[PDB]
Amino acid sequence: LTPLAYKQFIPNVAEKTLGASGRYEGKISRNSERFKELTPNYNPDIIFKDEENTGADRLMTQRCKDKLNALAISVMNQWPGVKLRVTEGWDEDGHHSEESLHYEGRAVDITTSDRDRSKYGMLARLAVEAGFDWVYYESKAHIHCSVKAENS
Numbered sequence: 001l002t003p004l005a006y007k008q009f010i011p012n013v014a015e016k017t018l019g020a021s022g023r024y025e026g027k028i029s030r031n032s033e034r035f036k037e038l039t040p041n042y043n044p045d046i047i048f049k050d051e052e053n054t055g056a057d058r059l060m061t062q063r064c065k066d067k068l069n070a071l072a073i074s075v076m077n078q079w080p081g082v083k084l085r086v087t088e089g090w091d092e093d094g095h096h097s098e099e100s101l102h103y104e105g106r107a108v109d110i111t112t113s114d115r116d117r118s119k120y121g122m123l124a125r126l127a128v129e130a131g132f133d134w135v136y137y138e139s140k141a142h143i144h145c146s147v148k149a150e151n152s
């Protein structure tokens with residue numbers, strides 16, 4: 001398996017194109033009907049930074065949970081004793097551009113639990129192999145992973 005390079009994305013097309021994660025559907029706000037279709041992730045093998053102390057980053061679509069949970073298994077296989085870590089998920093605080101998949105339960109920013117940046121390119125490759133529809137080495141400090149919408 002070949003690690004991704006900094007700022008590389010796989011597949012090598014824009015995130016919201018049909019062969020990647022597909023179009024945005026619209027921001028999800030708390031207590032909306034679409035919010036009620038999100039599912040919380042309390043997987044003990046994933047560390048959630050949850051800096052807002054709201055648990056919002058745990059709320060994600062079922063496809064996002066499926067791929068994230070597969071990635072959590074893969075991380076523990078690659079580096080025994082290390083866990084997947086989520087630093088950003090579903091944003092309620094307005095940090096991202098319009099049409100960001102972070103507003104839809106469809107995107108996560110991730111690291112390893114030890115914050116060893118030398119692992120991040122490989123972490124991104126593991127996310128591709130775990131089935132995320134788009135993976136991007138988005139900053140020196142994290143990998144961005146997203147999924148197609150349930151209606152796909």
Ligand SMILES: [Cl-]
Nearest residue numbers: 041042043069
């Ligand atoms: Cl779980």
Ligand SMILES: [Cl-]
Nearest residue numbers: 047048049050
């Ligand atoms: Cl943390």
Ligand SMILES: [Mg+2]
Nearest residue numbers: 052088089091
């Ligand atoms: Mg946040």
Ligand SMILES: [Zn+2]
Nearest residue numbers: 108109138144
């Ligand atoms: Zn991101």
